[PDB]
Design a protein around this ligand. Sequence first.
Ligand SMILES: N[C@@H](Cc1ccc(O)cc1)C(=O)N[C@H](C(=O)O)[C@H]1[C@H](O)[C@]2(O)CO[C@@H]([C@@H]2O)N1O
Ligand SMILES: N[C@@H](Cc1ccc(O)cc1)C(=O)N[C@H](C(=O)O)[C@H]1[C@H](O)[C@]2(O)CO[C@@H]([C@@H]2O)N1O
Lengths: 319, 319
Amino acid sequence: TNVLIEDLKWRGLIYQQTDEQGIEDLLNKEQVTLYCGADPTADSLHIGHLLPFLTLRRFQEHGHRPIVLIGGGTGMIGDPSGKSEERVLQTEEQVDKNIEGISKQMHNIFEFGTDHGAVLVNNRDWLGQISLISFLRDYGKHVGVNYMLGKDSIQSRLEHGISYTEFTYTILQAIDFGHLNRELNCKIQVGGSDQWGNITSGIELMRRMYGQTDAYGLTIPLVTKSDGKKFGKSESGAVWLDAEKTSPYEFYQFWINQSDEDVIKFLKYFTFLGKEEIDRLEQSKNEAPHLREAQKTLAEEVTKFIHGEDALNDAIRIS
Amino acid sequence: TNVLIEDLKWRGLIYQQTDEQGIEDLLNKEQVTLYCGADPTADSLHIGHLLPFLTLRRFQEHGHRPIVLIGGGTGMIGDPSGKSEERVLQTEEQVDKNIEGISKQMHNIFEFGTDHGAVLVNNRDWLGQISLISFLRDYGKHVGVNYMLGKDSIQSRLEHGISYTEFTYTILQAIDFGHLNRELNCKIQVGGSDQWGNITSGIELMRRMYGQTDAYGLTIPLVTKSDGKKFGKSESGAVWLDAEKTSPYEFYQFWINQSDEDVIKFLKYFTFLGKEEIDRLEQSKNEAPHLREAQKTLAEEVTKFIHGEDALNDAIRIS
Ligand SMILES: N[C@@H](Cc1ccc(O)cc1)C(=O)N[C@H](C(=O)O)[C@H]1[C@H](O)[C@]2(O)CO[C@@H]([C@@H]2O)N1O
Ligand SMILES: N[C@@H](Cc1ccc(O)cc1)C(=O)N[C@H](C(=O)O)[C@H]1[C@H](O)[C@]2(O)CO[C@@H]([C@@H]2O)N1O
């Protein structure tokens, strides 16, 4: 037992683990409960997010359980991570509308409603409780200011000027990890490299809150093209996984025009085919490019999956 | 939590539970590990078996784990259950060939090769160890002769004359239950009504072997048509799930010619559609029979699934 880790590794979906070995350990020992999430900073997800929720779906394959945290509370605050300009609070309505779009999608990428598997939690439910006073006492007490300015996210912002709220974002997100880690048994939290800071902070908090009751954080790498261009972007902004923001057709082509070079990779990252199916699918590319089979079965997969069998046919027929 | 049981019940797939309530209990409490199996008394499964392996697949839906016991050891002996004429030992080669066919199929109905989910065990592995002496001592000691003549299977045979071997079949099968119940954690064993006897005996043995370390047996009902005819049979014997014994086409039609009456039922039993999808699919039948939509989406499902998307198209095109 170590196949799952064997492939994540093969495909190149592991940019960093907190405890490389220990992760390997429980993953070959007990059926883990891992989660991931997004703040509804919009009403549609987008190729950018498609990667790690897939990685979550690749776990569920082998027996594990994923959980999906929509940004019900941290949404309204905004994660300064990466950013280099303070955020802009959305309106309660907007967020309440945004999470209807963002969730509307997950509910298709995942099968919610089972007796034991995949839960869609809304951190609005617990973060909505904790008060000003409590917060400081119970959690604040154990969050050193010297660790926070440590965060590679904020370090930056600190320079331009970081508001308090972006600054206390990390404590809210850390609170979540522990809460699931306690409430549902979350031991691994998977997220993008833009999430290292936060991932690592959630695990430290519970270390002095109870002595990290067995938590680990994994990070999927970052999608990178060969044309040197901000993957995910189009004059049509970024490829939204919503049919009326980015349609099966526009979707389709995106994948169909995948610069031959950065192809097999994207096959590995985004498609549920084997190393053998891909391997074959690599020859077909290495010496019969006219047929453009790789770049074709890619798009086929991602479009049928994300959009539909029907919306694949409906799409393919526009060349 | 109680949806899975909620539907099994809805569809009518529960002919009997050993401990009705307790089953409900652990199924709403912990992720169970249930199994089922067949002796390779042939080289192809058949509609008859398609039902309970589906039921096993309906568990895996909600989080549970199935296991598949091919008849590697009990195969060679034959389960007199139901039968009313002693068996006929197969040849080691035959069984060794038969289990290549029988397994060749499961490996498509189930996804083996994961880190935590679905295992294909071969009881040849443990039953091949136990000797004449051991057997009597360790297990035989705790199997009363008065319980065995109790078995509704043999009771019958007893009348025509039941050889010792058919008679000791039940002890071999009971041995299995406990072994998984101990080896892998098997708590529920699902099987046809022709398997009550055996199901119930496996649980009794471990009751005096250690005090039934938490075991239960469930039984799927029996497929029954409205035309009053031995479901599963055709002049082409019985509908073998093998393409070269019973092909996508011959397969297809079978389902397509499903006597309108015993339809929705078969939709429930054999298809992964909702109560809503079916409900709609029941109207379409109740008042627009010309279209024959029910009997059509049925066959469609079962054929694509069992045989292939491709072998569905390939099939549908023969009307
Ligand atoms: N502050 C986090 C959100 C969060 C909210 C609650 C938690 O309990 C833990 C984390 C973040 O940055 N997430 C992104 C988002 O949209 O909210 C998404 C990004 O958009 C992704 O592309 C999708 O998943 C990763 C990856 O960076 N990430 O979580
Ligand atoms: N003695 C059992 C086999 C067995 C072998 C090992 C075990 O550990 C427990 C049971 C039996 O009768 N099984 C059938 C078979 O072909 O072997 C199958 C039947 O053929 C089915 O149609 C398929 O599953 C059920 C149902 O009656 N059943 O187990």
